[PDB]
Amino acid sequence: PKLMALELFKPFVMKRLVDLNHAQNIKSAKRMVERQRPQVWDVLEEVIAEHPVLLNRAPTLHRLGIQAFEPMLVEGKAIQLHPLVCEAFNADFDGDQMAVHLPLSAEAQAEARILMLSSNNILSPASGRPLAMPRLDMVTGLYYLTTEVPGDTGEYQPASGDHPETGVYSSPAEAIMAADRGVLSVRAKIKVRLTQLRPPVEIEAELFGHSGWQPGDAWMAETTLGRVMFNELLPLGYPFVNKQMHKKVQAAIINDLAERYPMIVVAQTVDKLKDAGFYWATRSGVTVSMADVLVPPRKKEILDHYEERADKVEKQFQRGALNHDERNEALVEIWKEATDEVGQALREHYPDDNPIITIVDSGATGNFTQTRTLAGMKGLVTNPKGEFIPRPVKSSFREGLTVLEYFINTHGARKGLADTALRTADSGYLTRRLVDVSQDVIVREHDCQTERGIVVELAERAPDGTLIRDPYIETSAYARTLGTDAVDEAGNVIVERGQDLGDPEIDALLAAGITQVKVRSVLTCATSTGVCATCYGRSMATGKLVDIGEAVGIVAAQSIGEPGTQLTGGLPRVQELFEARVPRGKAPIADVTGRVRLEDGERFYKITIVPDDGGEEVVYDKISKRQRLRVFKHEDGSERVLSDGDHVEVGQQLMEGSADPHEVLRVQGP
Amino acid sequence: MLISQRPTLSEDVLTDNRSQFVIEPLEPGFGYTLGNSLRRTLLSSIPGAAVTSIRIDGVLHEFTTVPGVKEDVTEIILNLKSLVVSSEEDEPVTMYLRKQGPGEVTAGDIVPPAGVTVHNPGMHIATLNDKGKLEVELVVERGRGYVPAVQNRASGAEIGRIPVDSIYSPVLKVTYKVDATRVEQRTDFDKLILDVETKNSISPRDALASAGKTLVELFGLARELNVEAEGIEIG
Amino acid sequence: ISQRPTLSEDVLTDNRSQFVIEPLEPGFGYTLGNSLRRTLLSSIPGAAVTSIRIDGVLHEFTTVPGVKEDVTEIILNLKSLVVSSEEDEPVTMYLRKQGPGEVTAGDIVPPAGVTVHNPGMHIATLNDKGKLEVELVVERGRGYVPAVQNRASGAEIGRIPVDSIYSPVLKVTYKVDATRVEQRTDFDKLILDVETKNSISPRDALASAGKTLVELFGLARELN
Amino acid sequence: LKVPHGESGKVIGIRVFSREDEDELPAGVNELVRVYVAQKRKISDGDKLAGRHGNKGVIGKILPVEDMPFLADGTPVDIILNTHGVPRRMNIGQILETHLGWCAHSGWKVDAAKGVPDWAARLPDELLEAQPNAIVSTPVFDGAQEAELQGLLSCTLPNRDGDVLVDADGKAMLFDGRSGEPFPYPVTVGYMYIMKLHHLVDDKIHARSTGPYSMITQQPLGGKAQFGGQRFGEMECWAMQAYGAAYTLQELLTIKSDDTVGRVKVYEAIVKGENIPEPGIPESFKVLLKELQSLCLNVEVLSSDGAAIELRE
Amino acid sequence: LSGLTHKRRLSALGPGGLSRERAGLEVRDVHPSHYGRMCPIETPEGPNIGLIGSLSVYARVNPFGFIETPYRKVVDGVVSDEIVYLTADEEDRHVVAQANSPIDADGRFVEPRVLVRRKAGEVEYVPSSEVDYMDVSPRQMVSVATAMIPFLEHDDANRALMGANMQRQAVPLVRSEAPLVGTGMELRAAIDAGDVVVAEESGVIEEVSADYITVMHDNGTRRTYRMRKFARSNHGTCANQCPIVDAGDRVEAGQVIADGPCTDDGEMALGKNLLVAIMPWEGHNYEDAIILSNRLVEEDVLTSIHIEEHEIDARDTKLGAEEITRDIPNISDEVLADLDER
Amino acid sequence: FQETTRVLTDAAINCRSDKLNGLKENVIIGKLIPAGTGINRYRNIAVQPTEEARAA
Amino acid sequence: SNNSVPGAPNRVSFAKLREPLEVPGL
Amino acid sequence: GYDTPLGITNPPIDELLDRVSSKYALVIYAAKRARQINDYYNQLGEGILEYVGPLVEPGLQEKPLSIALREIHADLLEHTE
Ligand SMILES: [Mg+2]
Ligand SMILES: [Zn+2]
Compute the count of residue pairs across chains A and H with CB atoms less than 8 Å apart. Answer: 69
Cα angle, residue A279 at apex, residues A275 and A285 outer, rounded to 5°: 145
Paired with B95 in beta bridges are B138
The verdict on A263 touching H (C-beta cutoff 8 Å) is yes
Paired with E276 in beta bridges are D79, D190
Q: Are D230 and A66 in contact (CB under 8 A)?
A: no
Q: Identify from F29, F39, F42, F43 which residue to disrupt to test chain D contact, counting D C-beta atoms within 10 A and taking the largest count.
A: F29
The parent domain of residue H36 ranges over 1-81
Provide the H-helix boundaries in chain C.
29-40, 71-79, 202-221
Peptide bond preceding A59 in cis form (omega within 30 of 0): yes
Residues in Cβ contact with A544 at an 8 Å cutoff, skipping those fewer than 6 apart: A538
Residue C158: C-alpha distances to residues C51, C52, C60, C124, E269 (Å): 10, 9, 10, 20, 34
Say which ligand is closest to the CA of A57: 1
* Angstroms from E233 CA to nearest CA on chain C: 15
Report the interhelical angle of A263-281 vs A137-145 (nearest 10°). 80
Q: CA–CA separation, A55 vs D230, rounded Å?
A: 12
* Angstroms from C175 CA to nearest CA on chain D: 8
Distance from Cα A115 to the centre of ligand 2, integer Å: 25
Q: CA–CA separation, C188 vs C23, rounded Å?
A: 6
Residue E95: C-alpha distances to residues E74, E84, E135 (Å): 10, 14, 11
Q: CA–CA separation, A68 vs A52, rounded Å?
A: 6
Using CB atoms within 10 Å of the CB of residue A191, give its burial: 0 to 12 exposed, 13 to 18 middle, 19+ buried. middle
Interchain proximity C38–D72, CB inside 8 Å: no
* Angstroms from C109 CA to nearest CA on chain D: 30
Q: CA–CA separation, C107 vs A532, rounded Å?
A: 91
Q: CA–CA separation, C75 vs C66, rounded Å?
A: 17
The verdict on A107 touching H (C-beta cutoff 8 Å) is yes
Quote the distance between the C-alpha of residue C133 and its chain's center: 26
Backbone dihedral angles phi then psi of residue A192, each to the nearest 5 degrees = -135, 145
The 3-class SS string of chain E reads CHHHHHHCEEECCCCCCCCCCCCCCCCCCCCHHHCCCEECCCCCCCCCCCCEEEECCCCEECCCCCEEEEEEEECCCEEEEEEEEECHHHHHHCCEECCCCCECCCCEECCCEEEEECHHHCEEEEECCCCCEECCCHHHHCCCHHHHCCCHHHCCHHHHHHHHCCHHHCCCCCCCCCCCEECCHHHHHHHHHCCCEECCCCEEEEEECCCEEEEECCCCCEEEEECCCCEECCCCCEECCEECCCCCCEECCCCEEEECCCEECCEECCCEEEEEEECCCCCCCCCCEEEEEHHHHHCCCCCCEEEEEEEEEEECCCCCCCCCCCCCCCCCCCHHHCCCCC
Pick from A107, A436, A440: which is nearest to F22 by CB?
Answer: A440
Q: Are A625 and A611 in contact (CB under 8 A)?
A: no
Residue D17: C-alpha distances to residues D31, D32, E208, G16 (Å): 5, 5, 33, 60
Distance from Cα E8 to the centre of ligand 1, integer Å: 29
Provide the H-helix boundaries in A232-387.
247-260, 263-281, 299-318, 324-349, 355-361, 368-375
**Buried-exposed string B130-158: b where 16+ CB fall within 10 A, e elsewhere:** eebebebbbbbbbbbbbbbbbbeeeeeee
The verdict on B211 touching C (C-beta cutoff 8 Å) is yes
Q: Are E266 and G5 in contact (CB under 8 A)?
A: yes
* Structural resolution in Å: 3.9
Residues in Cβ contact with E246 at an 8 Å cutoff, skipping those fewer than 6 apart: C68, C125, E205, E208
Q: Are A48 and A73 in contact (CB under 8 A)?
A: yes
Q: CA–CA separation, E60 vs E63, rounded Å?
A: 10
Using CB atoms within 10 Å of the CB of residue A84, give its burial: 0 to 12 exposed, 13 to 18 middle, 19+ buried. buried
Residues in Cβ contact with C211 at an 8 Å cutoff, skipping those fewer than 6 apart: B223, B229, B230, B231, B232
Q: CA–CA separation, D77 vs A117, rounded Å?
A: 40
Residue C153: C-alpha distances to residues A373, C147, E333 (Å): 62, 12, 19
Pick from A38, A173, A180: which is nearest to B185 by CB?
Answer: A38
Compute the count of residue pairs across chains E and G with CB atoms less than 8 Å apart. Answer: 55
Residue E12: C-alpha distances to residues A385, E52, E55 (Å): 22, 6, 13
Q: CA–CA separation, E264 vs C209, rounded Å?
A: 41
Sign, CA torsion E320/E326/E332/E338: positive
- Name the pairing type of β-strands E60-61 and C101-103: unpaired
A75 SS3 class = coil
Residues in Cβ contact with A401 at an 8 Å cutoff, skipping those fewer than 6 apart: A378, A393, A395, A409, E153
Residues in Cβ contact with B113 at an 8 Å cutoff, skipping those fewer than 6 apart: B93, B94, B95
Report the interhelical angle of A324-349 vs A299-318 (nearest 10°). 170
Q: CA–CA separation, A84 vs A270, rounded Å?
A: 9
**For D126, which DSSP code?**
G
Interchain proximity E156–A413, CB inside 8 Å: yes
Paired with E114 in beta bridges are E126
Peptide bond preceding C23 in cis form (omega within 30 of 0): yes
Chains contacting E with at least 3 CB pairs below 8 Å? A, C, D, G
The parent domain of residue C94 ranges over 45-165
For B101, left (φ over 0), alpha (ψ -120 to 50), or beta? left
Backbone dihedral angles phi then psi of residue D303, each to the nearest 5 degrees = -90, 180
Q: CA–CA separation, C96 vs C108, rounded Å?
A: 8
Q: Are E162 and D54 in contact (CB under 8 A)?
A: yes
Paired with C109 in beta bridges are C94
Say which ligand is closest to the CA of A520: 2
Interchain proximity G26–E192, CB inside 8 Å: yes
CATH of the domain at C151: 2.170.120.12
Q: CA–CA separation, C145 vs C46, rounded Å?
A: 12
Q: Does D touch A (3+ CB pairs < 8 Å)?
A: yes
Interchain proximity E150–D93, CB inside 8 Å: yes
Quote the distance between the C-alpha of residue A342 and its chain's center: 31
The verdict on C21 touching B (C-beta cutoff 8 Å) is yes
Q: CA–CA separation, D144 vs A400, rounded Å?
A: 11
Q: Are A201 and A239 in contact (CB under 8 A)?
A: yes
Sign, CA torsion E6/E11/E14/E20: negative
Q: Are A553 and A442 in contact (CB under 8 A)?
A: yes
**For A594, which DSSP code?**
E
Backbone dihedral angles phi then psi of residue B200, each to the nearest 5 degrees = -85, 0
Q: CA–CA separation, D282 vs D256, rounded Å?
A: 10
- Name the pairing type of β-strands D79-81 and E272-278: parallel
CB atoms within 10 A of CB E148: 24
Backbone dihedral angles phi then psi of residue C95, each to the nearest 5 degrees = -155, 115
Residue A500: C-alpha distances to residues A192, A485, A489, A497, A505 (Å): 42, 11, 22, 8, 8
Q: CA–CA separation, H67 vs H73, rounded Å?
A: 10
Pick from A46, A110, A542: which is nearest to H31 by CB?
Answer: A110
- Residues 1-26, chain G, touching D (beta carbon < 8 A): 9, 11-16
Residues in Cβ contact with B134 at an 8 Å cutoff, skipping those fewer than 6 apart: B57, B66, B68, B69, B97, B98, B99, B100, B105, B126, B128
Which residues surround the ion ligand 2 when the cut-off is CB under 5 Å?
A: A 448, 525, 532, 535
**For B195, which DSSP code?**
E
* Angstroms from D158 CA to nearest CA on chain E: 17
Q: Are B125 and B105 in contact (CB under 8 A)?
A: yes
Interchain proximity C76–E300, CB inside 8 Å: yes
* Angstroms from A441 CA to nearest CA on chain F: 9
